[PDB]
Amino acid sequence: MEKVQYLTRSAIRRASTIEMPQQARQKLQNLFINFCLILICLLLICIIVMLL
Amino acid sequence: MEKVQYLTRSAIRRASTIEMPQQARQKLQNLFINFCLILICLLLICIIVMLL
Amino acid sequence: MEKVQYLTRSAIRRASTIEMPQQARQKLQNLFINFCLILICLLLICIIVMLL
Amino acid sequence: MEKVQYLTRSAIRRASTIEMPQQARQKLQNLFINFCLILICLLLICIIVMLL
Amino acid sequence: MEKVQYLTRSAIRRASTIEMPQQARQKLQNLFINFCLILICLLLICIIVMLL
């Protein structure tokens, strides 16, 4: 191998300044974007409800 | 093989906490983003219509 | 081959419920996102113009 | 080769209806998205400044 | 090798007009998008607070 041990070791070395179960990081970025859009939705609606 | 059986098995094991036909997950993330933009569009327009 | 004929056939089979020249689908997703941002721009500006 | 000449030729053939230095296209899509978010930021702020 | 030296050299040559620690560029694009969504959130909320 060597190539894998070098890649995995490179990550663990540069990721020593993080505290997440990995899955959270990936799921967060994607799920967040989607959630954000939905959030902006309900938001604009609220503003309108106030204008009425 | 072995590499495939390991990858596919790894997914089915970590995806046991989900209930979607796969296609929905992928199509949702992409289609949603696009739909969100359109949604924010009509939204800002509505707000303006109220200000008039 | 076999691998290609299987992949291409898998798409044509699952894409039988679509009606686009392919290029439109790809260009739309990307171009749309970009266009959406621009759209939200001019939108917020319009709202402000009304508040003045 | 043959595979490369076919891929590169396929692009130049389908990209004959474009006028950009390539780098602009890529940098634009990414930089634009980022810029758009910033733009929407200052925008919402402006609206608020008017409400005050 | 040759292929690597050509790729890495091609980047350093086209990236001579930049001043970032690399990691910042990648982390910025992703983290920014996410941050932007959150930003637009608190923004719409502020506007509403003013309408009340």
The residue ranges of every structural domain in chain D are 1-52
Q: Within its chain, how far is the Cα of B37 from the centroid?
A: 14
User: Could you give phi then psi for residue A3, rounded to 5 degrees?
Assistant: -65, -40
Name the residue among A32, A47, A50 with its Cβ closest to that of E37: A32
Say if CB E35 and CB A33 are below 8 A apart: no
**Residue for token pair 């260009």:** C27
A1-52 topology per CATH: 1.20.5
Q: Is C16 strand, coil or helix?
A: coil
Look at B47 and A52 and tell me if their CB atoms are within 8 Å: no
With 0-12 CB in 10 A as exposed, 13-18 as middle and 19+ as buried, what is E46? middle
Closest by CA to B46, choosing from C43, C6, E24, is C43
Length of chain E: 52
Q: Give the Cα separation of E46 and E34 in Å (integer).
A: 19
Q: Rg of chain D's alpha carbons, rounded to an integer?
A: 20
Distance CA C37, CA A36 (A): 14
Residue D25 is encoded by which pair of tokens? 């296209």
Interchain pair D47, C47: CB under 8 A: yes
Which of E18-27's residues contact partners 24+ apart within 8 Å by CB, and which partners? Answer: E23/A14
Radius of gyration of chain A (CA): 20
Both tokens of D48, joined, read 């608020």
* Cβ-based neighbour number of residue D34 at 10 Å: 16
Query: Per the structure block, which two tokens stand in for C40?
Result: 């939200």
| Experimental determination technique | NMR
- Sign of the C-alpha dihedral computed for residues E37, E43, E49 and E52 taken in this order: negative
Q: At what angle do helices D23-51 and E23-51 cross, to 10 degrees?
A: 30
> Token match 């040759």: residue?
E2
* Terminal Cα-to-Cα distance of chain E (whole angstroms): 66
Q: Is the dihedral of CA D41, D43, D44, D49 positive or negative?
A: positive
Q: Within a 10 A sphere around the Cβ of B37, how many other Cβ atoms?
A: 19
Do B48 and C47 count as a contact with CB atoms less than 8 A apart?
yes
Contact call for residues D37 and E40 (beta carbons, < 8 A) = yes
SS (H, E, C) D1-51: CCHHHHHHHHHHHHCCCCCCCCHHHHHHHHHHHHHHHHHHHHHHHHHHHHH
